[PDB]
Design a protein around this nucleic acid. Structure first.
Lengths: 167, 47, 112, 295, 184, 82, 146
RNA sequence: CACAUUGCGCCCGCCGGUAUUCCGGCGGGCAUGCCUGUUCGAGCGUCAUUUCAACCAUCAAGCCCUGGGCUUGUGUUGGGGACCCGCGGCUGCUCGCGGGCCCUGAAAAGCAGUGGCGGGCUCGCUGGCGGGUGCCAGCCGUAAAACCC
């Protein structure tokens, strides 16, 4: 699912700075000697939150490793409340490489070209089912509690030292 | 038999979900030391 | 102030001095031990030498038998009728590699 | 640092920026010119053109060898191509100036000795075969040697052409090189005893002859007209062997024209050694070749 | 570990290969080439992993078994048939005299007693060939360029050329010559 | 909107998420030095409304200050001492 | 000894007998496997049944490959409980479903001659049929002769 | 660096004394905290990495009544709907082949049935021969051929 996401997304990646300068020079030279609206992956925490609140986002991907976590800790709930499909991706550096930055906390797809409307819709359906159903099964509960052999042995040591005779 | 089948199935599922890719004392490593290449002489004329 | 845009194919198709300009003699430093030139070719390198230099078949067999890198002198003269028969030397690159290694690894000491 | 950042770009997916950074890296694999500029090290190592000509022995030996050798990782194909241009270019300088003096045939190859500005310069050419490489011969080291000597001959041939009056670089025809001109692809423009030995003679080279050795020898000692077979290469004065205006031709095989002189290549080499034409009857085909003497 | 992604990928690849092989079989002689007796140099390059049986047989016949390997072949009608059959896995074009000189002198080899001995001596040249009048390596070059009566045994003598990977570099006509400078 | 979401989440401090995060950080800062540098503000919304920008020239320092009194009370706060 | 039956749906074009066998045998051991196909034309209904030797292995396979995106297809891998596995479900398992050019067959059939005495009792049957056509054509009002 | 004694260390360069090794002198430098930026690193801190791409004729050849036209090349996801037909079998009911109309996300829950040739596997008889085989990522459409070797 991560690979499919980044395949539709890599087509809508932003323009690098060199490419943008080269394009601007191209129209400048043309005027020396009428375009459709660009479509790209929308990034930036505040911008993506605004798009989610205004229901312009079609898909949302949230990095799992943003510290501080408070920046994103409400994003899944906000996406669920607004009804936009959302998913959590391993690696803020990877969301970061789609844009041309070092780290992206969140990326979103708003609109795509006609050549990719069907692909984006199928990706939305696939991510929604195959991730949101499992997340609905286990998202409302507490995490943690992965005590191993040493931790559990320390636990029986503590209990057999505590509840036997004295406190 | 059953344990081998379960282990092989678990290995296959793990490979499907996550792919096939997954002296003792510590000293300060010897790093690169740059010599001074100043952009301006501190004193214009030597004494 | 800035160059106009150029298409990538035009950019692709688009993209010396006398080094002894200010030349003056300099004193030779006595720490410089240059590499002496290789010995000049002798009368044994010729593929068609005088018959006096033609050696014996038995010593030829001994030379081909004993293992490499132990001779006083690293080849034997051989008579060929023409460049048709003259073969390419098989250890030429090896010899020149050893010569280069002599340049960058052999110690140089001045001896009287 | 630039290589590290190119690796960063490649691992990040920015292929356009990676490609830009590799032009900025100036990779010899495509450029053919050496990794680093070596003008200052030339300056401080060789103080005079006399010393340059004195180490031209080893410089020419290495660049001839790597102009003949196959393409490898340390020395790429286009680096060998530039080596081939520069070596044939120095051969043009010798041909035009008639600076070549002696030649020699040995089981180790062909030795050439010339005298430039009073300096004796030698170089050995291996026979045109597949030089078989054995053992731990790492091509990085003599590849560095090749870069060094390529810079050396670039500057030396520039100075030599500026001294003779000819221009640098010579006009080289890629198409004619494709049709196989080797030494014949360069048209040398200018700026605005040795040459008599075969000057009044016309030669022909057969399929069996050493093409560029014979060509270089005869160009260096005067002969201005040789024909050869089309397979040998372009630039032949007369491709037809039946052409009647032929004086001498090399045969090295085991229409028998009357007005004709069949000679073996040893005749050309011992002529260039002895500064005098050798008996065609004593060097006729099918006869025991007279002994060769080192010059 | 192998993925269903791959499994489906090769399934569709072999499906198209079967479709295209039937099409040639139906339209025997699809390649619209004029009748000229010339030479074609063919280099096996990486392609589909699972080669169909008849292409595998043709590749074994042409001795293009390993990756990145070039051989010379006389351009006949059966030759054109097999070359355009094995087109997906090979790059083929018209050689040049300088190119064949470079290949034979730098990367030239010969097959003797099922052993590869480098083309180091015209004496070995008369030992293997010569019975048909091939005296020297450049005589071999001559016959290869101007294909003569003995091209079949000539090619049988020439052990296929192992090239090097391209260092920064269907019918490619003279562009395969640039390819073989890039690979040689 | 993330800034108001963080403002409300910081208003609700004894909430479970904030309490858990504050516990782990309190441990981390005790393991760290008394005064050390920060990288990124742990409270970006508070830093921004106080005037922090992500420019070359703005830095954060986290400082630990011992709590309590001198029965004498220090007229300057623990905030001013930090 | 409890074989486990898994149903796979939304099959991408190409994920057929051999690819299914290889993939799920790399997961485990298959007793039987069958994609459903049409008898008229050799085309699959994009669904298959796989009976594994081990029900547990079948369960892990279904869990890992239930909602998989393969060539724009979200698969449907679900274990069918042993209660409703129909005894005659794996009837064409492990065989070859061949493609039969029924159209060419009917065409060769139309071209094979025979003694048309039976075809003339059949033209008596087609005279009664065009009498049927005429009686339904009386509401039309069109008269046609033979 | 040193109560600072005009003493003692490290890097680079120079000068004078027999000097490539020695002596002496000279010149430029070597404090800490912190900020910005370089470059070199360390971390059982995190992540990616066994690649779901394009790749048919963006025109060809043969022709005709000479300039337009013709032939060829053959390439389609599946299911459903008391709907309208043609043609082949079925005693008949009906079933197949082709259409006409409508619907559904690249949707989905047994319904698998037509005879053969090569080859694989297997059992018997005297390597050969005769039998079978829900086996063929081979063909084929009555027989049988071709690949195959």
């Amino acid at each position: 699912l991560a690979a499919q996401a980044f395949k539709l997304l890599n087509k809508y990646r932003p323009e690098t700075k060199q490419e943008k300068k080269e394009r601007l020079l191209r129209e400048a030279t043309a005027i020396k000697e009428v375009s459709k609206k660009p479509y790209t992956v929308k990034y930036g925490l505040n911008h993506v939150v605004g798009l989610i609140e205004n229901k312009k986002a079609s898909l949302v991907l949230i990095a799992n490793d943003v510290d501080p976590i408070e920046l994103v800790v409400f994003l899944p709930a906000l996406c669920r409340k607004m009804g936009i499909p959302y998913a959590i991706i391993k690696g803020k550096a990877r969301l970061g490489t789609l844009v041309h930055k070092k780290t992206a906390a969140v990326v979103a797809i708003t609109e795509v070209r006609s050549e990719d409307k069907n692909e984006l819709a199928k990706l939305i359906s696939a991510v929604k089912e195959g991730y949101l159903e499992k997340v609905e099964d286990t998202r409302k509960r507490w995490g943690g509690g992965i005590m191993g052999f040493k931790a559990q042995k320390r636990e029986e040591k503590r209990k057999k030292s505590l509840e036997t005779a004295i406190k | 038999s059953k344990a081998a089948k379960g282990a092989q199935a678990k290995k296959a599922a793990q490979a499907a979900l996550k792919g096939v890719h997954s002296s003792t004392t510590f000293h300060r490593p010897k790093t690169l030391v740059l010599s001074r290449a100043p952009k301006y002489p501190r004193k214009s004329i030597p004494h | 102030r800035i160059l106009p845009y150029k298409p990538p194919e035009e950019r692709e198709r688009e993209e010396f001095y006398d080094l002894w300009q200010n030349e003056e003699p300099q004193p030779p430093n006595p720490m410089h031990i240059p590499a002496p030139k290789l010995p000049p070719p002798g009368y044994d390198l010729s593929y068609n030498p005088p018959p006096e230099y033609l050696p014996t078949k038995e010593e030829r067999e001994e030379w081909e038998k004993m293992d490499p890198e132990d001779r006083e002198k690293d080849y034997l003269p051989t008579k060929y009728d023409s460049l048709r028969k003259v073969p390419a030397w098989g250890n030429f690159v090896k010899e020149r590699f050893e010569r280069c290694m002599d340049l960058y690894l052999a110690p140089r000491v001045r001896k009287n | 640092a630039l290589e590290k950042k190119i690796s960063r770009a490649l691992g990040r997916g920015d292929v356009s920026n990676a490609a830009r950074l590799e032009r900025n890296a100036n990779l010899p694999e495509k450029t053919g010119k050496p990794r680093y500029t070596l003008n200052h090290i030339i300056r401080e190592r060789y103080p005079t053109f006399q010393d340059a000509l004195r180490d031209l022995d080893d410089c020419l030996s290495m660049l001839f060898l790597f102009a003949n050798l196959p393409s490898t990782t340390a020395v790429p194909a286009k680096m060998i191509a530039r080596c081939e241009r520069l070596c044939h270019e120095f051969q043009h300088y010798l041909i035009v100036t008639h600076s070549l003096r002696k030649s020699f045939l040995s089981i180790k190859g062909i030795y050439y000795q010339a005298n430039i500005q009073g300096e004796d310069i030698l170089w050995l050419v291996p026979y045109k075969f597949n030089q078989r490489i054995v053992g731990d011969v790492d091509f990085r080291i003599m590849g560095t040697f090749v870069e060094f000597y390529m810079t050396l001959l670039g500057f030396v041939n520039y100075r030599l052409y500026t001294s003779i009056g000819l221009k640098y670089p010579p006009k080289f025809d890629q198409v004619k090189d494709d049709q196989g001109a080797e030494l014949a692809a360069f048209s040398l423009e200018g700026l605005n005893d040795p040459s008599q030995l075969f000057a009044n003679f016309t030669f022909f080279l057969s399929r069996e002859t050493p093409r560029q050795p014979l060509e270089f020898i005869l160009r260096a000692f005067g002969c201005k007209r040789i024909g050869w077979d089309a397979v040998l290469g372009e630039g032949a004065f007369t491709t037809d062997e039946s052409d009647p205006r032929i004086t001498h031709q090399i045969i090295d095989r085991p229409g028998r024209y009357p007005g004709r002189i069949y000679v073996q290549p040893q005749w050309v080499w011992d002529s260039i050694n002895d500064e005098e034409l050798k008996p065609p009857e004593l060097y006729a085909p099918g006869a025991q070749l007279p002994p060769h003497l080192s010059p | 570990f192998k993925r269903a992604e791959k499994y489906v990928k090769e399934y569709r690849e072999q499906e198209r290969e079967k479709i295209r092989l039937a099409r040639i079989a139906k339209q025997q002689g699809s390649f619209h080439i004029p009748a000229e007796a010339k030479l074609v140099f063919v280099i096996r390059i990486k392609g589909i992993n699972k080669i169909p049986p008849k292409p595998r047989k043709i590749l074994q016949l042409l001795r293009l078994r390993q990756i990145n390997n070039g051989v010379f072949v006389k351009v006949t009608k059966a030759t054109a048939e097999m070359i355009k059959i094995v087109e997906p896995w090979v790059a083929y074009g018209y050689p040049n005299l300088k190119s064949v000189r470079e290949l034979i002198y730098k990367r030239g080899y010969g097959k003797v007693n099922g052993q590869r001995i480098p083309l180091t001596d015209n004496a070995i040249i008369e030992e293997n060939l010569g019975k048909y009048g091939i005296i020297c390596i450049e005589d071999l070059i001559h016959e290869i360029f101007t294909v003569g009566p003995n091209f079949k045994q000539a090619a049988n003598f020439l052990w296929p050329f192992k090239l090097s990977n391209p260092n920064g570099g269907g019918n490619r006509e003279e562009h395969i010559n640039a390819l073989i400078r890039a690979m040689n | 909107g993330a800034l108001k979401y963080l403002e409300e989440l910081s208003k609700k401090k004894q909430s479970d998420v904030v309490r858990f995060l504050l516990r782990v950080r309190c441990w981390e800062y005790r393991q760290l030095n008394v005064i050390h540098r920060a990288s990124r503000p742990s409270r970006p919304d508070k830093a921004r409304r106080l005037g922090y920008k992500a420019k070359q020239g703005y830095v954060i320092y986290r400082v630990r200050v011992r709590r309590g009194g001198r029965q004498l009370k220090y007229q300057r706060s623990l905030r001013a001492t930090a | 000894s409890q074989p486990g039956v898994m149903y796979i749906a939304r099959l991408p074009h190409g994920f057929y007998e051999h690819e299914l066998r290889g993939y799920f045998s790399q997961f485990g051991e298959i007793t039987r496997l069958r994609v459903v196909r049409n008898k008229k034309t050799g085309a699959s209904r994009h669904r298959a049944f796989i009976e594994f030797a081990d029900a547990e292995v079948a369960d892990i396979a279904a869990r890992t490959m239930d909602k998989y995106l393969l060539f724009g297809h979200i698969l449907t891998c679900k274990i069918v409980p042993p209660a409703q596995v129909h005894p005659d479900l794996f009837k064409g398992a492990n065989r070859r479903f061949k493609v039969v050019p029924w159209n060419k067959m009917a065409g060769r059939q139309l071209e094979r001659p025979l003694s048309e005495s039976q075809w003339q009792v059949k033209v008596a049957k087609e005279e009664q049929r065009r009498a049927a056509r005429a009686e339904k054509l009386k509401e039309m009002g069109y008269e046609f002769e033979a």
